[PDB]
């Protein structure tokens, strides 16, 4: 209700101020709890928002509380439509009610033993850190921080997802990428319970062949300075086999590469026929219309590939590839080349 | 190696969780270790760093790094390929844990009479944990360069 302790002495001022930081973070949450252009738009947290919305119904939280009274992991039937795993991580109630406040009340806020207050601030720490992150991201954080979900919690949550062991093993071996494709949605603090929805990715398509296409502008190299013609393949990006088709990711930085695994999000992808691969082998093939751009913008540039470098060298530009121990080894003539 | 604190008290629970957070960061990071414009050429920002990382992974290469920074905190090391790199030992938590903390702990079966020791440890341990957290949320590559990375 209120810490009715008087704030003067050095011992009281630290624990009382520590209590106020807890009560303010709690109060804060109640206030808060109220190519490429051809792609299709999604709602990244439509799944998570849907679950949070269910908790706001009257008396719905009570079902959650009663199930997590005996264990720290339970499957709850919500009144609307979805069964969700629920997890009580920190129990601040029984600490404040049965270990701290009795110690505090007995000696009139003179905490004679400094050990109790230090334990409290650490027990209180995760809440403030979670509160602090939610306070800076409008209730939706990404990537999923270690205060949101520790590795111990994440690997255990990984094990309970409805996927094969091959999919489970992938996520546990690359937990860092999982964090970056996840969201945390803060939504309700009522009836002595705080709960937020964690939204983890599900990788349903694994181990299919995937390749990266790099392209660079191709211009003629004629003697006339201003009279030149240029051409560029626009189908750059990642292409993975998927369901007899190819999942195409035009945006370069939408995927994260670890060794041979490409972690991508299908939401920012187009689904293309398998004949797309013919544009690499036969750009004039009559079965798929290869995408290209045209220009007279005769500018030199270079494209770094996975295992080398593409060099589009035009005009009077000096283009050179060098070795660290030997210096320049090859001088590029005008045109597009590769080393 | 192992936390065998059998006696339970509010102080023991404090150092043990503080010890566990350190023991977790090491393992956590160890897991991580295994208009216009359209004409602009594409680059590899960390190809230089990736190349340096790859050499440190070479057999017997870390020993070269370790032994050069054993006596001083600044050294130029010649890697097996041919490259000399500036090396910097910023935190020495090893010599802290072995000769000041671990002896204090063992004496009374984890009952620390001076709460200052846990506060010093958590302060000594803070810089490591904060560096880990940035790497833990940014896939091992941070930018801009934080003050915890390099003061």
């Amino acid at each position, epitope marked *: 209700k209120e810490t009715k302790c008087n704030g003067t002495d050095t011992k009281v001022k630290l624990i009382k101020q520590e209590l106020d930081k807890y009560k303010n973070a709690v109060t804060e949450l109640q206030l808060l709890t109220q190519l490429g252009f051809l792609l299709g738009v999604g709602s990244a947290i439509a799944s998570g928002i849907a679950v949070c919305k269910v908790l706001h119904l009257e008396g719905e939280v009570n079902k959650i509380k009663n199930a997590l009274l005996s264990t720290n992991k339970a499957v709850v039937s919500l009144s609307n439509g979805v069964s969700v795993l629920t997890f009580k991580v920190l129990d601040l109630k029984s600490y404040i009610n049965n270990q701290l406040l*009795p110690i505090l*009340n007995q000696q009139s806020c003179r905490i004679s033993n400094i050990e109790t207050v230090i334990e409290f601030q650490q027990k209180n720490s995760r809440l403030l850190e979670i509160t602090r992150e939610f306070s800076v991201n409008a209730g939706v954080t990404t990537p999923l921080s270690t205060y949101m979900l520790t590795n111990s919690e994440l690997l255990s949550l990984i094990n309970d997802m409805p996927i094969t062991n091959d999919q489970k093993k992938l996520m546990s071996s690359n937990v860092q990428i999982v964090r970056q494709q996840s969201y945390s949605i803060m939504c309700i603090i009522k009836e002595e319970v705080l709960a937020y929805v964690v939204q983890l990715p599900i990788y349903g398509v694994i181990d299919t062949p995937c390749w990266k296409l790099h392209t660079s502008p191709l211009c003629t190299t004629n003697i006339k300075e201003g009279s030149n013609i240029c051409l560029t393949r626009t189908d750059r990006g990642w292409y993975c086999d998927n369901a007899g088709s190819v999942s195409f990711f035009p945006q370069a930085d939408t995927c994260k590469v670890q060794s041979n695994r490409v972690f991508c999000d299908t939401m920012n992808s187009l689904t293309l026929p398998s004949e797309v691969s013919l544009c690499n082998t036969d750009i004039f093939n009559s079965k798929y219309d290869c995408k290209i751009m045209t220009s007279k913008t005769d500018i030199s540039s270079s494209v770094i590939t996975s295992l080398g470098a593409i060099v589009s060298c035009y005009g009077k530009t000096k283009c050179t590839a060098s070795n660290k121990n030997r210096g320049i080894i090859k001088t590029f003539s005008n045109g597009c080349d590769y080393v | 190696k192992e936390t065998k604190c059998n006696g339970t008290d509010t102080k023991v629970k404090l150092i043990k969780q503080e010890l566990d957070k350190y023991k977790n960061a090491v393992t956590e990071l160890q897991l991580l270790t295994q208009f216009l414009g359209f004409l602009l050429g594409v680059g590899s920002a960390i190809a230089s760093g990736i190349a340096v990382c790859k050499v440190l992974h070479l057999e017997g290469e870390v020993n070269k790094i370790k032994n050069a920074l054993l006596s001083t905190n600044k050294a130029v090391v010649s890697l097996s390929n041919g490259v000399s790199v500036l090396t910097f030992k910023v935190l020495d938590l090893k010599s802290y844990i072995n000769n000041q903390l671990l002896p204090i702990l063992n004496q009374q079966s984890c009952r620390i009479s001076n709460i200052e020791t846990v506060i010093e440890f958590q302060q000594k341990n803070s810089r490591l944990l904060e560096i880990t957290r940035e790497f833990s949320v940014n896939a091992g590559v941070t930018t801009p360069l934080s003050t915890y990375m390099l003061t």
Partner: antibody, heavy 126, light 108 residues
């Protein structure tokens, strides 16, 4: 430094009801959890119940609920305990014990007894 | 209800002796356990709260330990004025319950 003064010992007839008072000096009743503990001869103490006026909550032990009423008169800083339908098993020394309730959240419960009354020996006999 | 088992029921020790008293709970009560001293005919006096915290004004020879379901009370140098009955008490859930009590006597 706060002394709890209970009503005097007395003999009550079987089947009747008894009222015991408990007077606080030096502080307000709202500032405490006021508990009632009894001790039969040759037994340990048994907690009967407690009231938390700052929260306006009364709690009764399961054995005693429905025949015990504990009230807190904030106008006089006196707590009371009324036990009805007295019988032989009730012959015991009844203690009034407090726990400080300065900074309390909701659903706060009694935990300990640091300040005690002198005790009231209620003897049920003919 | 939670039953508290205090052991032993009685003990005899000389002045200056080290004496240990144990309290066990019927279920896990964390460290929500108190200790009281009752001299014959007097009201009980609070000695230890939350299993291990010393009450102000209580002689330094008293100490408490334990967690979970088993707790202990230890007097480092038993003195003549310690002759009394001691009770442990839990508050994990209601009703608050006590141990059977341990009566401490001095051998002289």
């Amino acid at each position: 430094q706060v002394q709890l003064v209970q009503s005097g010992a007395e003999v009550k007839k079987p089947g009747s009801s008894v009222m015991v008072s408990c007077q606080a000096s030096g502080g307000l009743l709202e500032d405490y959890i006021i508990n009632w503990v009894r001790q039969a001869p040759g037994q340990g103490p048994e907690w009967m119940g407690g009231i938390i006026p700052v929260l306006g909550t009364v709690h009764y032990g399961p054995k005693f609920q429905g025949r015990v009423t504990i009230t807190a008169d904030e106008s006089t800083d006196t707590a009371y305990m009324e036990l009805s339908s007295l019988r032989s098993e009730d012959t015991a020394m009844y203690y009034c014990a407090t726990e400080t309730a300065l900074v309390v959240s909701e659903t706060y419960l009694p935990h300990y007894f640091d300040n005690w009354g002198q005790g009231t020996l209620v003897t049920v006999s003919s | 209800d939670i039953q508290m088992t205090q052991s032993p029921s009685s003990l005899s020790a000389a002045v200056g002796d080290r004496v240990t008293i144990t309290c066990q709970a019927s279920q896990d009560i964390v460290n929500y356990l108190n200790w009281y001293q009752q001299k014959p005919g007097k009201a009980p006096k609070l000695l230890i709260y939350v299993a291990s915290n010393l009450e102000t004004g209580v002689p330094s020879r008293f100490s408490g330990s334990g967690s979970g379901t088993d707790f202990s009370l230890t007097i480092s140098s038993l003195q003549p004025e310690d002759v009394a009955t001691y009770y442990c008490q839990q508050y994990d859930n209601l009703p608050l319950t006590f141990g059977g009590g341990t009566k401490v006597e001095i051998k002289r």
